[PDB]
Write a protein that binds this DNA or RNA. Sequence first.
DNA 1: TGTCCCTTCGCGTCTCT
DNA 2: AGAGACGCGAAGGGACA
Length: 497
Amino acid sequence: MQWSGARALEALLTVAGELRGPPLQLDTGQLLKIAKRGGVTAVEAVHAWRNALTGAPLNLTPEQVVAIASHDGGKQALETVQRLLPVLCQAHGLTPQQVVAIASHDGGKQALETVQRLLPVLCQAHGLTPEQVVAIASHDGGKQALETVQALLPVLCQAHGLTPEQVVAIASNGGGKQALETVQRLLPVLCQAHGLTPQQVVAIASNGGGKQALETVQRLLPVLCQAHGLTPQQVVAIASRGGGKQALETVQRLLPVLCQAHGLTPQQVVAIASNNGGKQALETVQRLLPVLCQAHGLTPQQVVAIASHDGGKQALETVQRLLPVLCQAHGLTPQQVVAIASNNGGKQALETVQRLLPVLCQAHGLTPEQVVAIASNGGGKQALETVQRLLPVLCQAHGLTPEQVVAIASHDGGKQALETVQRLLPVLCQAHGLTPQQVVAIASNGGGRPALESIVAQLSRPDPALAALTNDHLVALACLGGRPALDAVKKLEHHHH
DNA sequence: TGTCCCTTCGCGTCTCT
DNA sequence: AGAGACGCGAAGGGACA
């Protein structure tokens, strides 16, 4: 948007304003979101057929249009969607959301067109479910994954003895075509030579960049075992758990350095690299471990804990940066900050804690101890933000104590629990006669949302299990193990009674 | 410059157990 | 309770027209 022509760009700001206009109603964040990954052709196209997409047969929502648009070749997809959505939904049985899901990717046109062209031959001749075809296609380069699945599924299943589930698992990723081809080539080589169960070979391929990881494993598997004293199992961990090529390479490169000079066990090095962006975590503990754990206060064990997660790099960097301010200015022990950072999205929690500790403690009346409990979970940021937002409405409109709201929030998926309590606490308490503290009890666990959702569905529309269990029982189960422990009981009557 | 494809990395939620 | 699977999606890069 720099150097090609004098004057104009007048037509661009004309449309940019009108998209705030009624059909779509886009905010600033959305427009820039489109502009960035979709380009201007995208922004133009959105405008161009903003009415056509909102009503008509399509009846897409605004956020759906935005989703489709904000990708390389967005214009192309938006067009192909208008054209093919109804035929895919009617003549092949898909939901609109499924069509949108296929479209909301780079090269959406190609995916949509290839789905239409091959959803039958796959479902009929290879016995795949349409869910599975959508899964393969709902990615970048879906056309290629689809096309490759067709070509290699017979060969992979007969010759190399794989389930279709496994082929799908492989293809249902970015660069499936690659992962598939690379497996075909390297399945025999990896199996009889480097001694790996086919299950392990599929494990590795069933991530993004699987081709890389397969190739890199074959190459580096011997080395890492003899020279660096790892097990084949440990090597496969690193390769399958997200690290891929990058992590394997980085392990080789930094295993001696981290063990000898920085004093870690090879167990800990493997734990760190067996993750997404292992490379990043390893390089981030090579530096930063000294200054963290020898000036910034912590023990190696604690540093290994923070790094042994997705985005460990981010966590370490934001710990090192905010450990002083949080300890000093907000009065938290290092042990609390480590707890906050030792989760997925540590960076996000620490930063959110920083900006909301005061707010929660002043305006909403909470101990810091409570805030840290909320923050010391997966998706801490989300809970904190949701607590702030929903604490008042829960306490007033639904009559809960703060201590209850905090208890709900203090689990992985806190946000979801809170939101779901708000939704269902009414219908549960009046229509089916549960008592708030029961509803809170159910919710105050991991998987609290689906626990609730699951417990409602049971009462409102009783299944074969004809009562058998009373309401008070179901609640006990639901607290005991949520949806699993509910589906499990259901599945102890279906073919039974 | 836009479109398509591939790889790497990070965030959030649930379940195993 | 913590570890690990899963889903979702941003971000970065390469190839080609």
